[PDB]
Amino acid sequence: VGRLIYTAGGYFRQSLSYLEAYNPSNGSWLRLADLQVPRSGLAGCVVGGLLYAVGGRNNSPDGNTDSSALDCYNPMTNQWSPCASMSVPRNRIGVGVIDGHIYAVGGSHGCIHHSSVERYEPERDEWHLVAPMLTRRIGVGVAVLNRLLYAVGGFDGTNRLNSAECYYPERNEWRMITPMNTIRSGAGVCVLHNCIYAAGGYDGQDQLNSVERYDVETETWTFVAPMRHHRSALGITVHQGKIYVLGGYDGHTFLDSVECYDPDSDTWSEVTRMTSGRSGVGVAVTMEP
Numbered sequence: 001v002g003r004l005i006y007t008a009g010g011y012f013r014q015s016l017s018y019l020e021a022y023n024p025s026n027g028s029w030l031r032l033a034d035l036q037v038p039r040s041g042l043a044g045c046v047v048g049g050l051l052y053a054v055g056g057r058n059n060s061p062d063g064n065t066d067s068s069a070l071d072c073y074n075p076m077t078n079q080w081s082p083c084a085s086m087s088v089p090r091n092r093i094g095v096g097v098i099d100g101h102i103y104a105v106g107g108s109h110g111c112i113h114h115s116s117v118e119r120y121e122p123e124r125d126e127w128h129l130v131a132p133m134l135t136r137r138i139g140v141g142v143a144v145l146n147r148l149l150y151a152v153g154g155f156d157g158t159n160r161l162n163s164a165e166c167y168y169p170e171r172n173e174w175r176m177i178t179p180m181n182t183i184r185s186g187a188g189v190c191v192l193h194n195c196i197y198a199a200g201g202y203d204g205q206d207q208l209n210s211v212e213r214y215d216v217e218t219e220t221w222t223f224v225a226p227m228r229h230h231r232s233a234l235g236i237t238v239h240q241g242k243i244y245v246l247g248g249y250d251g252h253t254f255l256d257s258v259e260c261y262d263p264d265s266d267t268w269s270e271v272t273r274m275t276s277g278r279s280g281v282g283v284a285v286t287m288e289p
């Protein structure tokens, strides 16, 4: 009990510093301490009850600065603290947590599209590079299932991708998995039960409302019910057995819509609205502040 969905950063006209937390138990939103530096295209995650904001870019009227930053938010104090920075700036990043360690995957630095991957050790406050992906990927969806790390879709600098790959930590090795049925860059990727879900994204022509899931045992991708809204650069998380998608861009509007997927009924429903429309947020779940 007592866990909230935190959304950090994002974009609307410029990169944002907002940290806001939604309580599914009562529908309330809380505005919390702003990020020290505005950022869009970041990712969020939680280790040990602390929220981490990783990478992104500060797009402002006076600049576009890609971020190598790792910042830690403590709900007990409502304060952000800098942690060790990554080896390289990573905008349009994806992240995943394995056994208390944060993996930062891909992303861009200027016109460079990274295949590199690095791993953070909170206990030592250190990053170290691990094996790079087989493909350069920005706008990459990342999730962890059964202590394996998945990198899904994205953009390699020439093509948006339907491909996906998996990292096996004990071998420090990446291997391709079955590709998705749809090209997706800037999708929301998460894990629910024994499947990796890829929701939304951009296929090179349109923002998508379709959603597909990879069953790690059968190695197949299957479509589930589509979202009500097409969206790219959405936030996503799982809470109490349901997927939540937050914001994104539908080709016309920066959405404030938050939708919730119930896997038992295979249905999406609108559950709340963010306080303002935005895309490119980082999202994670931890205890209320």
Ligand SMILES: COc1cccc(S(=O)(=O)N(CC(=O)O)c2cccc(-n3ncc(C(=O)O)c3C3CC3)c2)c1
Pocket: 010, 011, 040, 041, 042, 057, 091, 092, 138, 139, 140, 154, 155, 160, 185, 186, 201, 202, 232, 233, 249, 279, 280, 281
């Ligand atoms: C029109 O304004 C917009 C519209 C949507 C999002 C933003 S954003 O400020 O949130 N943002 C812009 C940036 O960093 O350029 C961002 C963040 C994460 C990933 C991605 N991402 N990565 C690759 C692709 C693709 O086109 O294949 C995309 C885009 C999402 C499909 C972009 C600004």
